[model samples]
Target: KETAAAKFERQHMDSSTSAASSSNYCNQMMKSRNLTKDRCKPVNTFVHESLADVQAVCSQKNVACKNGQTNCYQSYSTMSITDCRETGSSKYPNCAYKTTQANKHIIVACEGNPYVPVHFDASV
Candidate 1:
């Protein structure tokens, strides 16, 4: 079984994004990475930074999770990220996504003994 931390990394971390130039980056990635297994994940984000840096976000400023949990944290500095949003005409088995890159602070939900990030909450 894959841990939440590992699953988050698999779905959202992209250290090398040179090939992410295409508008189809998200469309292809969401499928290739298995995020499109059951249905299209309407919206998602991918961090274009090192794994260590991404993990360190858990130690940053405290914030509230969407579920009102205290385990959420936000990065202090802006980081490169890509937002993936499904197109209005997108449909399962033929999903399409709009790719937009930007530099922003990332928010994540942390858990476990070591307090590593398990979920990407948002990017600001």
Candidate 2:
């Protein structure tokens, strides 16, 4: 079974790529990363930081989740992130994404024994 930590890493962490120079970065990654299988993820973010740094976000101050969960936390400093938004013309089996880079304080939801991030809630 895939753990929450593993899922978070698969969906959000992308230290291999720097700042996503190409416009097709999202288009390529979204599919290759398996986020474009059955349907495209409407809005998703890929954090451009080390796994340790991202994991440390759990130690940050607590914040209320958008869905009202209690385990969310906001990063203290702005972190590099790339936003992948589905274009209006996007359709199944042909997911198109608009890649935009930004440095923001990201909010993520944490869970489990170590209480690591499980889901990326938002970037503020």
Candidate 3:
């Protein structure tokens, strides 16, 4: 079974590199990371921070999720991230994505014993 925490890491974490600003980052990452295997992932984000930094966000209890979920929390500081959105021209097997990079607060949902992020809520 795929744990929610593992899915969250696969879907959101991109901190394995230090290289920045590749125009094809989203295009390659989306497929390379298996986001486009079955169908195009309409919208997704890659967080450029450490797992520790992101896990710490769950400790915050002030903010709420977009849907008003109690499990959601916002980061204390802005973090580097890239948003990937499927282009209208994108196809199932060959997904095309538009990338937007920004430094903003991350909203995420967490759960379980380790209390790691289980979902990516948004960026603001």
lDDT of 3 by residue, 33-111 (tens): 8999889989999999999999999997557778877889889899899999999999888899998888989999999
| Most TM-score-accurate candidate | 2
Question: Tens digits of per-residue lDDT for model 1 on 2-73?
Answer: 998899988889988733557878988899888888999999899988999999998899999989999999
Per-residue lDDT over 27-122 for candidate 2, one digit per residue giving the tens place of the 0 to 100 score:
988898899988998988999989988899999979999998888999998999999999999998999999999999999999988989999999
What candidate 2 gets wrong by more than 4 Å, as runs, is: none
Candidate 1 to native Cα RMSD, angstroms: 1.3
Off by over 4 Å in 3: 18-20
Candidate 1, 77: how far from true, in Å?
Answer: 0.7
Q: Which candidate is the best by lDDT?
A: 2
Q: Over 4 Å off in model 1, which ranges?
A: 18-20
lDDT of each: 0.89, 0.91, 0.88
Candidates sorted on lDDT, descending: 2, 1, 3
Better of 1 and 3 by lDDT: 1
Which residue pairs does candidate 1 place in steric collision?
none
